[PDB]
Amino acid sequence: TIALSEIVSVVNTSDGRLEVFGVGTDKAVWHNRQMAPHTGSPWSGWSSLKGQVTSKPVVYINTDGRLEVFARGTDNALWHIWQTATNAGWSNWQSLGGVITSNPAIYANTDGRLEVFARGADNALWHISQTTAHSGPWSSWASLNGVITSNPTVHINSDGRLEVFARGTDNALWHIWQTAPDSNLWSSWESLNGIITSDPVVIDTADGRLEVFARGADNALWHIWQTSGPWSGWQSLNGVITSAPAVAKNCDNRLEAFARGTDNALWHTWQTVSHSGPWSSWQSLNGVITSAPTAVRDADGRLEVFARGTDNALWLTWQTASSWSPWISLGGVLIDASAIK
Amino acid sequence: TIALSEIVSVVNTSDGRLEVFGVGTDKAVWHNRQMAPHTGSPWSGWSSLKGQVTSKPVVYINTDGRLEVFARGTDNALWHIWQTATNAGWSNWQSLGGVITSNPAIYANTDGRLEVFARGADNALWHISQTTAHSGPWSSWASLNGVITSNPTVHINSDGRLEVFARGTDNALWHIWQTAPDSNLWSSWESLNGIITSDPVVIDTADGRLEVFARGADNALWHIWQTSGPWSGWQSLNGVITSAPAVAKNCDNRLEAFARGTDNALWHTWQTVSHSGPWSSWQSLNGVITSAPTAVRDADGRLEVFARGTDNALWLTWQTASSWSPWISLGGVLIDASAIK
Ligand SMILES: C[C@@H]1O[C@H](O)[C@H](O)[C@H](O)[C@H]1O
Ligand SMILES: C[C@@H]1O[C@H](O)[C@H](O)[C@H](O)[C@H]1O
Ligand SMILES: C[C@@H]1O[C@H](O)[C@H](O)[C@H](O)[C@H]1O
Ligand SMILES: C[C@@H]1O[C@H](O)[C@H](O)[C@H](O)[C@H]1O
Ligand SMILES: [Cl-]
Ligand SMILES: [Cl-]
Ligand SMILES: [Cl-]
Ligand SMILES: [Cl-]
Ligand SMILES: [Cl-]
Ligand SMILES: [Cl-]
Ligand code: NA
Ligand code: NA
Ligand code: NA
Ligand code: NA
Ligand code: NA
Ligand code: NA
Ligand code: NA
Ligand code: NA
Structure with a gap:
């Protein structure tokens, strides 16, 4: 067995938008897309690419x-x-x-x-x-x-x-x-x-x-x-940590690691000052999550983090000047289809 | 004829260091390298790749x-x-x-x-x-x-x-x-x-x-x-502007343009707020330059700008938290070998 897996696959598109891919109760692949290449962009909502999958x-x-x-x-x-x-x-x-x-x-x-x-x-x-x-x-x-x-x-x-x-x-x-x-x-x-x-x-x-x-x-x-x-x-x-880790680069190339903690909130640690720098103490981004987090850098050079919620919806928090955004819901009902658990 | 050309070619290496390429009085290609993948890194100094060139x-x-x-x-x-x-x-x-x-x-x-x-x-x-x-x-x-x-x-x-x-x-x-x-x-x-x-x-x-x-x-x-x-x-x-322009992306993807002004100082204008944002008024980065500027984003996600000085040396200024660094000299004697002028 392995720590709880990431629930979605995410990519920055050729035109700088985040698109996420997960699995529904029907075993179909579902797809959610930023409309615009910016932090806090409206989302498409979930649409089906169909199929029947037995992996992430x-x-x-x-x-x-x-x-x-x-x-x-x-x-x-x-x-x-x-x-x-x-x-x-x-x-x-x-x-x-x-x-x-x-x-x-x-x-x-x-x-x-x-x-x-x-x-x-x-x-x-x-x-x-x-x-x-x-x-x-x-x-x-x-x-x-x-x-x-x-x-x-x-x-x-x-x-x-x-x-x-x-x-x-x-x-x-x-x-x-x-x-x-x-x-x-x-x-x-x-x-x-x-x-x-x-x-x-x-x-x-x-x-x-x-x-x-x-x-x-x-x-x-x-x-x-x-x-x-x-x-x-x-x-x-x-x-x-109580899930798989996720890691992404800040736009200044500082590594930043994310994982579910013992309180089932999102925790993160980051390199400080520069990509050569020492790692921070762990800090909480709150929420209550039922998946490993998935981290990606958007077209504004900000980290965005996805995780399944208690309601089995995908939720989303991102970096701001000072801190991180409150968790918002992108809806849907996601299952962990990982071929290895 | 065309506005005064860039005097060097610059690349971010596979290991995140800036390396610059120019031409000496001897028509050889000369090469200068950051030691470390960071803003304000020490430089190699100029070394010869030899050859005899009639272009940039x-x-x-x-x-x-x-x-x-x-x-x-x-x-x-x-x-x-x-x-x-x-x-x-x-x-x-x-x-x-x-x-x-x-x-x-x-x-x-x-x-x-x-x-x-x-x-x-x-x-x-x-x-x-x-x-x-x-x-x-x-x-x-x-x-x-x-x-x-x-x-x-x-x-x-x-x-x-x-x-x-x-x-x-x-x-x-x-x-x-x-x-x-x-x-x-x-x-x-x-x-x-x-x-x-x-x-x-x-x-x-x-x-x-x-x-x-x-x-x-x-x-x-x-x-x-x-x-x-x-x-x-x-x-x-x-x-x-009295030179060719140079353009680079900030690590948040905001475009930023550089050119010599009428006072032969470096001037720049940048997108504000985001990569979708409106352009700033032109502002001075000082110096007195005898080439178009050459702009590149380093491994810390900061812009660095190179230009030939009155002494025909290559000089360098980069972004800081608040402003830009004072011009420093990387030495050498560079000629404009552009096949078109
Ligand atoms: C979208 C298309 O792209 C082409 O490469 C070229 O730039 C055409 O002008 C443009 O209409
Ligand atoms: C902007 C800054 O970025 C850091 O890498 C970390 O994610 C901090 O939480 C955030 O406040
Ligand atoms: C540098 C070299 O790279 C290889 O891909 C592998 O990771 C080896 O362990 C390492 O010694
Ligand atoms: C950090 C900031 O970056 C801007 O794009 C511009 O270059 C400003 O001069 C600098 O102060
Ligand atoms: Cl909207
Ligand atoms: Cl556990
Ligand atoms: Cl083997
Ligand atoms: Cl040094
Ligand atoms: Cl002119
Ligand atoms: Cl033709
Ligand atoms: Na091609
Ligand atoms: Na294109
Ligand atoms: Na990979
Ligand atoms: Na919800
Ligand atoms: Na390969
Ligand atoms: Na490598
Ligand atoms: Na090109
Ligand atoms: Na000098």
Whole structure:
């Protein structure tokens, strides 16, 4: 098992608007969109992209600005749906086949080819890629092996090499990386040790280093980062958290971590002064939440945070000059469809 | 002729540091680098990448994070030099041949292929591209036709289509665009009218629109922007400017324009409140400058501005909480090698 998951996938669109993707009681993917590229923008309200999903639905933006949403189907295949033109209409759901046992994890290669990662029936990591930039057809599936006990997460190195992180059977953080950008050449799995009780979250720093966040054995927030040299040790950011963490960059590149606390309110800790700076003490953004928070930077360079409420609606709070906005409701009824819990 | 040009090309590196590229009295390309990814970082001082250039040297970052610098040689061919690995050593200067009569203009296609644009001996626009992502070999040269009287500038649409802007023989702003991302299919040249007395500067807004800035017949700063619909009219931002303009985005996405005034000090006007906001009155950042300013956002989300001084050194001022830093000198002796003046 893992700390309570994020309930939505969120993206900044090609035209600077937040769009969120979640799952209803009907197992359909639902979609909510800012009208305008600004903090406090009116929202579309929830509309259905349909389908029937047995994972968290994960949106990624193609290098041509077209959104594409990936989800496990009821047949355990990888399914996807995409915009046919930038911020226009959607395709039908189409199958990329395979059998997967995790939420999908997506990144664009430096050549614009999307590559999707998911656990398989053998509990190994499997991957499939676009054969050409922002387009089908897709490659055959293949395995990157290993044995994983969490949803996988992928990011890109500052040199364009994809890198995947996942919990192993010993509950350590393990990783594997491309040896060259755009490559089918990968490293062996390597252990970053520690003991993690959440899905790992990965982000690139202002200075092009991967930094990984996860809940530890002691239910504190831990992190570890790249220094072609080795990783740091695991370091505690303290706190006591009851969900997966979420991490986003402020527009000045200061990292900021969010998680549900023991009082089921939203808590956050941030780098102070600069992206090189020391982390703040944990502070409360209130609310009562029934999901991990989901954090994203909007087109005004402000953080916005989404979480499911006691009513199972999605609620939203954002940064102001002085503080954070009171929680507002975007309505809907959201379920946690995470293929791993 | 055109308003006085920018004297350096600047890039934010894969690890968040500013690096500047200019030309010495010897016609070699010289290089200055921040040590650390922060405002007010110590600088390397000027070191030579050698070569012999008859244009402004233009740096672009490959999708694998490798810097690549393009310049006209003494033989009027396009030449380039690149990092062999991300923020490591440089290749030798190599020729991409052709005969060009402008500074080169560079963008990455959505598939990671760099595409270079330059005026030819026939005064038409010519282009050459990497055949695969972030790598040689390069295509054959070909022409996109037209007749141009300024350095060309290229940007990417929010849908991944490259678009090139240049002054025509009637002194209007003209443009041409890819009809599909990564394509060799281009539109006809079209006129955006107006009368411009500087190279055009192009930037993408927070909401994914191209916005073009240029000095007008009245030596005011003018701009025009995308609304698949038509462009705005030309609108004046007033001022009286004696150089090319420079434009950069604040970390909250507010556009900010810089130019030399009649008193040969640096002047700037900025969007207020938000990226949707009205433009400020022009205000002075002092100094006495012998080049257009060059503006870039650093890894702390602050604007830094470079300009040649009366001593022909490069000087530097940046945003603070309240105001801007006093001008400091980064030394060197820089010449304006712009292939068009
Ligand atoms: C710098 C290098 O980057 C790799 O992608 C991986 O993270 C290795 O652990 C690290 O040593
Ligand atoms: C503006 C400032 O941003 C910080 O990163 C943190 O989120 C604080 O709560 C907020 O007041
Ligand atoms: C939306 C469309 O975009 C094109 O790239 C070009 O700028 C056209 O003028 C404009 O009408
Ligand atoms: C911080 C603020 O930023 C504005 O965009 C403008 O550059 C002002 O001069 C500066 O004081
Ligand atoms: Cl409204
Ligand atoms: Cl292995
Ligand atoms: Cl818990
Ligand atoms: Cl120092
Ligand atoms: Cl034409
Ligand atoms: Cl003048
Ligand atoms: Na890659
Ligand atoms: Na990721
Ligand atoms: Na990296
Ligand atoms: Na509600
Ligand atoms: Na393109
Ligand atoms: Na450009
Ligand atoms: Na655009
Ligand atoms: Na000096």
